[PDB]
Amino acid sequence: KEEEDDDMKELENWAGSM
Amino acid sequence: DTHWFHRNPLKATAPVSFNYYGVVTGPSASKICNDLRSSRARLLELFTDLSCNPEMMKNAADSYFSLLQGFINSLDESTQESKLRYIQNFKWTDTLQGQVPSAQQDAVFELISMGFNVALWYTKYASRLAGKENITEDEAKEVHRSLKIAAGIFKHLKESHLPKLITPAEKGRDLESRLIEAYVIQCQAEAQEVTIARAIELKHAPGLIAALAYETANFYQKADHTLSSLEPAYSAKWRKYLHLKMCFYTAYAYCYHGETLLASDKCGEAIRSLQEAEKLYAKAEALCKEYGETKGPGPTVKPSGHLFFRKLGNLVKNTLEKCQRENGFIYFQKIPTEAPQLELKANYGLVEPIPFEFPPTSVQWTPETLAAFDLTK
């Protein structure tokens, strides 16, 4: 299943930018 | 793609001259007073300046705080403090107190009070961007960043500076521990709002969205609660905003949670989840009206139509109808009696406030310049 984890990153990168 | 963030008024302060008359003796001590006076004035002007951006604020703020820092920090001993700490009286209004000012003759009081206004400015810069119908991607990110910057300033003020104040703040005042904590929390919730919108627009898994939404609601609840020991009179408007947003985002959680259940062939449960979403949304729909009828700080607003408020409404109906349709030809499942309970996972950290520190004491402060003060009158 496991997709949820993969996505979580894309936010962390968007947020952890500025 | 837009957000509505309730904002209380900025704090206002008495202009401060930094004129010590016979005390100051010398070209150098006089210059530092003018530089303090003018850097302060320029900073204050930015708070109401519409062309101001985050860069200007930081630039003007550092300029002032670095000079102001000469009234607080010792130049050599980290255990000592400027002899000038008490030389100047500073006078400030408070966010819930209207025009009723409060004054302390303490340079530490000024540093915290002005810093607090810098933080508010960032929350207001964020909320202005969030309201543009045309808001771009970069602007949304800036909204998020600005709120995180604000969170970190408020928090820094609270942890490392508030405890220096020899006169504690009275209940309800901006420099009090409990109130200042609510601003930190609100900023996190508001910033997390932007994150959720990107995740939704970006089509992320419903489990993540539901969880993030739920945590957002929880933050709003904690802020609401944090303020709850305040006099109801002047907190009532603000708490209505927080509570409305809390209910509103819980609906978001139930809505996306329904998708998770439906995707799991638990459609009966999914329908029940969406029904709770309708309820939470209606509660929010009720609270947002009370806010518009509730007197208190900031302009009057009537939250219903915000593009944000209506989207969840359309999402709930369409998501609900989808479930029942599946149920009618596919699942044939019972609708559970009790609403589902929410996960409550641990923090996702997407909301971490950006750490703040004031700049170092300006290099204009030297022992010679400092020596040109007091002299005892």
UniProtKB/Swiss-Prot annotation, chain A:
It is found in: Cytoplasm, Cytosol; Late endosome membrane; Midbody; Nucleus envelope. It is linked to Cataract 31, multiple types: An opacification of the crystalline lens of the eye that frequently results in visual impairment or blindness. Opacities vary in morphology, are often confined to a portion of the lens, and may be static or progressive. In general, the more posteriorly located and dense an opacity, the greater the impact on visual function. CTRCT31 includes posterior polar, progressive posterior subcapsular, nuclear, and anterior subcapsular cataracts. Probable core component of the endosomal sorting required for transport complex III (ESCRT-III) which is involved in multivesicular bodies (MVBs) formation and sorting of endosomal cargo proteins into MVBs. MVBs contain intraluminal vesicles (ILVs) that are generated by invagination and scission from the limiting membrane of the endosome and mostly are delivered to lysosomes enabling degradation of membrane proteins, such as stimulated growth factor receptors, lysosomal enzymes and lipids. The MVB pathway appears to require the sequential function of ESCRT-O, -I,-II and -III complexes. Its overexpression strongly inhibits HIV-1 release. It comes from the Eukaryota. ISGylated. Isgylation weakens its interaction with VPS4A. This is Charged multivesicular body protein 4b. Probable core component of the endosomal sorting required for transport complex III (ESCRT-III). ESCRT-III components are thought to multimerize to form a flat lattice on the perimeter membrane of the endosome. Several assembly forms of ESCRT-III may exist that interact and act sequentially. Interacts with CHMP6 and CHMP4C. Interacts with PDCD6IP; the interaction is direct. Interacts with VPS4A; the interaction is direct. Interacts with VPS4B; the interaction is direct. Interacts with CHMP7. Interacts with CFTR; the interaction requires misfolded CFTR. Interacts with PTPN23. The modification Phosphoserine is found at S17. Belongs to the SNF7 family. Widely expressed. Expressed at higher level in heart and skeletal muscle. Also expressed in brain, colon, thymus, spleen, kidney, liver, small intestine, placenta, lung and peripheral blood lymphocytes. The acidic C-terminus and the basic N-termminus are thought to render the protein in a closed, soluble and inactive conformation through an autoinhibitory intramolecular interaction. The open and active conformation, which enables membrane binding and oligomerization, is achieved by interaction with other cellular binding partners, probably including other ESCRT components.
UniProtKB/Swiss-Prot annotation, chain B:
Signal peptide: none annotated. Keywords: Acetylation, Lipoprotein, Membrane, Methylation, Nucleus, Prenylation. It is a lipid-anchor. Residues 90-377 form the BRO1 domain. GO terms for cellular component: extracellular exosome; nuclear envelope; nuclear membrane. Changing H204A: Does not affect SYN2 interaction. Does not induce SYN2 ubiquitination. Does not affect recruitment to sites of rupture. Impairs NE repair. It holds the Pfam family BRO1. The modification N6-acetyllysine is found at K283. Changing L350A: Loss of SYN2 interaction. Abolishes BROX recruitment to sites of nuclear envelope (NE) rupture. Impairs NE resealing. Does not induce SYN2 ubiquitination. CDD domains: BRO1_Brox_like (cd09243). Farnesylation is required for nuclear envelope localization. Its main location: nucleus. The keyword Lipoprotein applies. One of its GO terms (biological process) is mitotic nuclear membrane reassembly. Monomer. Interacts with CHMP4B. Interacts with CHMP5: this interaction allows the recruitment of BROX to cellular membranes. Interacts with SYN2; this interaction promotes SYN2 ubiquitination and facilitates the relaxation of mechanical stress imposed by compressive actin fibers at the rupture site. This is BRO1 domain-containing protein BROX. It comes from Homo sapiens. The gene is BROX.
